[PDB]
Amino acid sequence: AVPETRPNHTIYINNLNEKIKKDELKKSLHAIFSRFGQILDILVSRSLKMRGQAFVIFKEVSSATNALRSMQGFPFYDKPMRIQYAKTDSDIIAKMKGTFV
Amino acid sequence: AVPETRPNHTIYINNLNEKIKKDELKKSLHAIFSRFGQILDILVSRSLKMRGQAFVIFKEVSSATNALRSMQGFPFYDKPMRIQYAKTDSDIIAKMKGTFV
RNA sequence: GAGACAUUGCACCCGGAGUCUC
RNA sequence: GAGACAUUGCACCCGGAGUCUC
């Protein structure tokens, strides 16, 4: 009982604000998760599972681990955003090996 | 007048068959473009611009140049498929730099 | 088609992109 | 909604994914 998130490639924030215009979350999420690293991409939808969250992509665990240990429960526009690692992280990293490496 | 395709990252076949079930093109396209290299992905739709073609992705020009100089106008199921380089190639290669390289 | 109310959630999946007609 | 007929074409873009109602 009681599972665990654990660090895995990147992370995903949750409990986001419920009064943002979606694009406002990218300007804030894609502006704070890159200052101390380099954001590769973010995932924000309007489905039940994607309600009040936004998966962020970095490149290595040590990059997202540094971004997750900086805004741990931080106030965005009017609520504390909780950060949680992404056990699945960017699914393109499963075939990205063909990038050039 | 008279432009040129030129080699660029990967390629795209055209004049494909007009009696395939779509999945049959992937079994043939994704089976011959990998034997002499390593296919990264293929693009086949049903739009006017995507009529009788299938963009293939490799990794480097020398990989697609080798695949394009092997099946130049080859018969698939009942027609000669013409191969043409993809000046745009996979658009993810524009931000894939964050893969790990 | 759209809006309000719900959920505290590991998503990057999926479907369309040429006209014509029943 | 689907099928036939068209186009010989550098696409990987885009839109949905919680219910309730007008």
Side-chain angles (χ1 to χ4, degrees), chain B residues 16-97:
Chain B
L16 264 155
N17 267 120
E18 295 213 287
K19 55 265 281 161
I20 312 301
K21 276 173 173 270
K22 214 268 266 196
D23 212 61
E24 258 85 293
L25 236 66
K26 301 276 283 206
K27 265 277 148 275
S28 263
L29 296 161
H30 199 252
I32 308 172
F33 267 96
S34 211
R35 294 169 69 190
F36 41 58
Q38 189 78 58
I39 304 170
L40 196 66
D41 214 72
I42 307 169
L43 237 99
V44 293
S45 194
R46 274 182 161 230
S47 180
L48 202 297
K49 285 82 165 298
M50 304 270 87
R51 218 89 294 261
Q53 54 209 267
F55 283 77
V56 60
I57 315 301
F58 267 120
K59 184 262 270 196
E60 208 197 300
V61 190
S62 62
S63 191
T65 302
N66 266 262
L68 186 143
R69 282 202 69 176
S70 273
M71 266 191 119
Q72 201 95 61
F74 223 62
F76 255 129
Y77 286 93
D78 213 282
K79 243 192 203 174
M81 63 103 135
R82 302 189 85 200
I83 308 171
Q84 283 193 70
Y85 289 100
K87 39 149 62 159
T88 41
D89 68 73
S90 237
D91 201 84
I92 97 310
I93 306 174
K95 302 149 290 199
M96 233 176 154
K97 189 213 186 177

Side-chain angles (χ1 to χ4, degrees), chain A residues 41-52:
Chain A
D41 214 72
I42 307 169
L43 237 99
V44 293
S45 194
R46 274 182 161 230
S47 179
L48 202 297
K49 285 82 166 298
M50 304 270 86
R51 218 89 294 261

Side-chain angles (χ1 to χ4, degrees), chain A residues 10-11 38-42 55-59 89-90 93:
Chain A
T10 201
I11 71 177
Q38 189 78 58
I39 304 170
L40 196 66
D41 214 72
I42 307 169
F55 283 77
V56 60
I57 315 301
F58 267 120
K59 184 262 270 196
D89 68 73
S90 237
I93 306 174

